[PDB]
Amino acid sequence: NEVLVLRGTLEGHNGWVTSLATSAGQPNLLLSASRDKTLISWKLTGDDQKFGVPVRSFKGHSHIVQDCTLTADGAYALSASWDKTLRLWDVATGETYQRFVGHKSDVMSVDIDKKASMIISGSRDKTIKVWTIKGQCLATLLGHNDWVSQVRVVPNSVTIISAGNDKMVKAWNLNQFQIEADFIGHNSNINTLTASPDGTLIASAGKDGEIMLWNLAAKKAMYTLSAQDEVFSLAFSPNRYWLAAATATGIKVFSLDPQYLVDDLRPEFAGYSKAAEPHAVSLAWSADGQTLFAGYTDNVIRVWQVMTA
Ligand SMILES: [Mn+2]
């Protein structure tokens, strides 16, 4: 008796909302990144026709901000930018504490370990970099033969996973700075990947809309879910066996146990033309899993909540 219901919007960005992040420490805080070169922290009220408001603007990047995340406590933000750098921000003030310089091209992805002791990034320079929180590059991981689109830390000795336009998904052992597993099977550019909260599964997808699920430990492919259209973002529910996928035609929410389509979220748009309908390119679940945030190509964040029918 549970459905996803459109609750409201968060307006304030002036470019595609490319990335979203929530935090367990601050369940009322949302972080967003945009092609408008900025990030925005939001205060969530969840009230009427204004689910929340912008509290801070994070300005400093000279190009598109592609990815962002918050530390566990929500005190700090990380951003990856096409300007070839990452920045660590003080969420309270909106200031940049540290710059991360080293990539030779667009930085497409950023993530951080649970201890918030080291930072990982992916770039169109084909490399993955490991940094200290003080902005010092420690090492560069080589193996991808094309752009790296996304890098993520696997929840659990740190293990990360990456995907790129070489159709490869890779797991790396940071204790060795070496490849742990090659996941072959994608036939198209991979836009996004993510690890299940228990760190046992990998989900990855891109252009052809094929969402491949991998058994990390066994280093094997399990099955593929057809989303039909290009997938831009994937996000496992923190508390449900649900996998949300932002696609060119809507947000498909898959139940994995048992297997069925929870929903295909498709908002009604203005009167845009069909040809020009905006779509979601970013996703984030709230810590409690009762809220799903999605950033769109019309600069708007849309908010769904799990309610009783
Ligand atoms: Mn993370």
Side-chain angles (χ1 to χ4, degrees):
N1 208 4
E2 272 173 335
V3 293
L4 290 161
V5 181
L6 182 55
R7 284 284 73 183
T9 69
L10 297 171
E11 311 173 343
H13 275 300
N14 293 122
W16 290 13
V17 180
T18 56
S19 182
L20 298 170
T22 59
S23 82
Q26 291 188 73
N28 293 324
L29 166 69
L30 178 71
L31 184 70
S32 60
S34 169
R35 288 196 162 181
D36 69 12
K37 308 179 195 175
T38 74
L39 299 93
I40 293 173
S41 54
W42 308 79
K43 178 179 183 179
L44 308 179
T45 66
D47 196 18
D48 199 304
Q49 65 176 359
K50 189 186 294 179
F51 195 86
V53 297
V55 279
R56 303 282 186 279
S57 181
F58 298 73
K59 313 181 180 184
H61 280 301
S62 58
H63 213 317
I64 295 174
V65 187
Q66 186 67 38
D67 198 23
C68 71
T69 191
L70 287 159
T71 50
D73 54 21
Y76 299 94
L78 281 173
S79 58
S81 172
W82 290 34
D83 69 6
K84 299 173 177 177
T85 79
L86 309 103
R87 283 172 179 235
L88 175 68
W89 309 76
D90 183 307
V91 173
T93 71
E95 70 197 356
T96 293
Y97 266 135
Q98 187 65 43
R99 287 177 66 248
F100 298 68
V101 183
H103 282 294
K104 302 304 186 56
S105 193
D106 307 347
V107 187
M108 298 299 289
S109 186
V110 59
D111 204 4
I112 185 165
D113 69 320
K114 182 56 56 53
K115 294 177 180 291
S117 65
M118 69 183 49
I119 296 158
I120 66 173
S121 60
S123 168
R124 282 170 168 156
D125 70 6
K126 300 190 189 75
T127 75
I128 298 169
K129 284 172 182 292
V130 188
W131 316 69
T132 69
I133 60 188
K134 300 304 184 188
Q136 184 185 353
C137 185
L138 293 172
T140 299
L141 303 176
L142 311 161
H144 281 288
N145 285 312
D146 211 322
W147 299 346
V148 181
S149 63
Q150 205 157 82
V151 298
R152 292 292 181 258
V153 172
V154 180
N156 60 3
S157 60
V158 182
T159 303
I160 69 170
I161 54 179
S162 58
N165 286 357
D166 62 355
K167 284 68 173 174
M168 293 298 304
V169 169
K170 295 168 178 289
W172 313 70
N173 179 330
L174 282 201
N175 289 167
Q176 303 291 327
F177 295 156
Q178 285 176 61
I179 188 71
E180 182 166 12
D182 267 332
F183 294 93
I184 308 166
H186 279 291
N187 289 342
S188 76
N189 282 2
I190 312 160
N191 296 328
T192 175
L193 88 172
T194 180
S196 59
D198 67 358
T200 59
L201 308 184
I202 302 175
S204 58
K207 185 58 178 185
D208 60 15
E210 290 291 280
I211 303 166
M212 305 194 61
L213 273 290
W214 318 81
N215 182 332
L216 181 55
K219 303 187 182 182
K220 278 189 51 185
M222 285 153 29
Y223 58 84
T224 302
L225 297 172
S226 294
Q228 309 298 338
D229 311 291
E230 177 170 15
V231 176
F232 300 101
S233 175
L234 288 166
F236 283 109
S237 166
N239 61 339
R240 291 183 180 85
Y241 290 108
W242 285 10
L243 176 59
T247 88
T249 64
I251 306 171
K252 292 191 169 68
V253 181
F254 294 89
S255 173
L256 286 52
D257 187 18
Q259 301 279 354
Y260 69 93
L261 188 62
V262 174
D263 208 345
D264 194 333
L265 310 180
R266 308 188 179 197
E268 179 166 359
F269 271 114
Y272 287 78
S273 58
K274 312 277 166 146
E277 279 195 6
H279 54 267
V281 292
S282 60
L283 295 175
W285 291 99
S286 59
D288 69 2
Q290 294 298 98
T291 309
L292 176 61
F293 303 87
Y296 283 72
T297 54
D298 68 351
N299 316 341
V300 177
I301 300 169
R302 293 178 170 78
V303 187
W304 283 266
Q305 284 181 329
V306 185
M307 305 178 84
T308 53

